[PDB]
């Protein structure tokens, strides 16, 4: 009741261009996509987007998680300066141990590489 103002929702994948058109308040536009936010605004804005987006998804389905858990997950994915997935490819960049890597996925290739 207090106000009426119009926000613009963009279904697309160029954050930099939408931040730079005349008449969009570029300081307060955001994106779902952590890769766009990383490429445009750096690792610390991408870190907050992982927090905001997980918490948004949990709240809609009526789940609740203490913020300290989604915080640690995002700090884990960004401490090496790049947003690393929880995939086998991200884990191979985070974890040094051969036997840890060989006990998840691609169990043959990691053991022959450690031999080489």
């Amino acid at each position: 009741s207090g106000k009426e103002k119009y926000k613009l929702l963009v279904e697309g994948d160029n954050l930099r261009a939408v931040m730079a058109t005349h008449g969009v308040k570029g300081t307060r536009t955001t994106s779902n996509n952590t890769y766009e936010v990383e490429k445009t605004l750096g690792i610390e804005a991408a870190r907050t987007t992982i927090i905001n987006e997980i918490q948004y998804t949990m709240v809609n389905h009526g789940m609740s998680i203490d913020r300290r858990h989604v915080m640690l997950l995002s700090d884990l994915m960004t401490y090496k300066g790049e947003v690393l997935g929880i995939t086998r490819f991200g884990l191979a960049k985070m974890k040094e141990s051969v036997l840890m890597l060989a006990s998840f996925e691609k169990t043959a290739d990691h053991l022959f590489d450690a031999a080489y």
Binding site: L76, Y79, K95
Partner: protein, 58 residues
């Protein structure tokens, strides 16, 4: 599958005696756990450690 992936990745983290969270290799993930150092299982309020209105009435 998702649970297997998350656990394999995050199993190592441990909260240390110097109030830091470190990986097994000794790199830092967080300088203090969750910003406060506080435990989610101990929250009497909505993510906050106490609720002062209730405690004073008690």
């Amino acid at each position: 599958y998702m649970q297997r992936r998350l656990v394999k990745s995050l199993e190592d983290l441990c909260s240390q005696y110097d109030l830091t969270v470190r990986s097994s290799t000794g790199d830092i993930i967080q300088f203090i756990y969750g910003g406060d150092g506080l435990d989610p299982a101990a929250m009497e309020g909505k993510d906050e450690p106490l609720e002062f209105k209730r405690v004073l009435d008690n």
